[PDB]
Amino acid sequence: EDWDLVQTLGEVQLAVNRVTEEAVAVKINIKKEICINKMLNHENVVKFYGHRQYLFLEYCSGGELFDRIEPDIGMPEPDAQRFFHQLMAGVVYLHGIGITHRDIKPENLLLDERDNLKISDFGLATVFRYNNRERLLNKMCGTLPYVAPELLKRREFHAEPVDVWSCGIVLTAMLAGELPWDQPSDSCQEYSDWKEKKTYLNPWKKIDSAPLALLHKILVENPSARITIPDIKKDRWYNKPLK
Numbered sequence: 001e002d003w004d005l006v007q008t009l010g011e012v013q014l015a016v017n018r019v020t021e022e023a024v025a026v027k028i029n030i031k032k033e034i035c036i037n038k039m040l041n042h043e044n045v046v047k048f049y050g051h052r053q054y055l056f057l058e059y060c061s062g063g064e065l066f067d068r069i070e071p072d073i074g075m076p077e078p079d080a081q082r083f084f085h086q087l088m089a090g091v092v093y094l095h096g097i098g099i100t101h102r103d104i105k106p107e108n109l110l111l112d113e114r115d116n117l118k119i120s121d122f123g124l125a126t127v128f129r130y131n132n133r134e135r136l137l138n139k140m141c142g143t144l145p146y147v148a149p150e151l152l153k154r155r156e157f158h159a160e161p162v163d164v165w166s167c168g169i170v171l172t173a174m175l176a177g178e179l180p181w182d183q184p185s186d187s188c189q190e191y192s193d194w195k196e197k198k199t200y201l202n203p204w205k206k207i208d209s210a211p212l213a214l215l216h217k218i219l220v221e222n223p224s225a226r227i228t229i230p231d232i233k234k235d236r237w238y239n240k241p242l243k
């Protein structure tokens, strides 16, 4: 139980145990990260083993989701669906226990050996439900291309639709190989074009009609009109058999 630090991965290093040889990722604001990690137990979330500051995390030898995406092309729709089902599974879970990730993007979706997707890095994560009472979020967190528009123009907002939006931006990235806009603001041509339904432009043009119908439902500007996860679970492309 004296871990060898083999190499740096990102400030995270790879630690291997000499006695048993089980690999773990070691990560070298934080009190909350450990706090939140302590609550989590899901097969689509990076596992927290413990800490001493040093964080002992499940090491994913698959890499990250971005590696799986070919620029300007994306990936086979079947792999995208499988990844999205698992992305949804993880997010449903986090939300189920009052946690929002707040920074969902392919950099934070890690792949294990089986290629199972794992949600990583709860550094920006926060509680949005406690004792069955929702707390709206007023803070701005995340990464401009994946953030929901309401977070840019509203004092307070609901946590869940924000995570849903980012998941849609991720689905776009898996199916088109590119990100639709710099940020979701009217001052941005690409975003104005989408709100205008100019789907003959990129990235939307690279995307089959069925997944694109789902993105029409996810990338909805009004967070109250935006599709919810239970309803995504009933969407036609989501339940479409793919080889």
Ligand SMILES: CC(C)(C)Nc1nc(N)c(C(=O)c2ccccc2)s1
Residues within 6 Å of the ligand: 009, 010, 012, 024, 025, 026, 027, 057, 058, 059, 060, 061, 062, 063, 064, 110, 120, 121
């Ligand atoms: C090196 C890689 C991404 C294929 N495997 C990883 N496993 C874990 N556990 C990683 C991280 O925890 C991490 C954290 C921040 C930045 C990069 C990787 S990265």
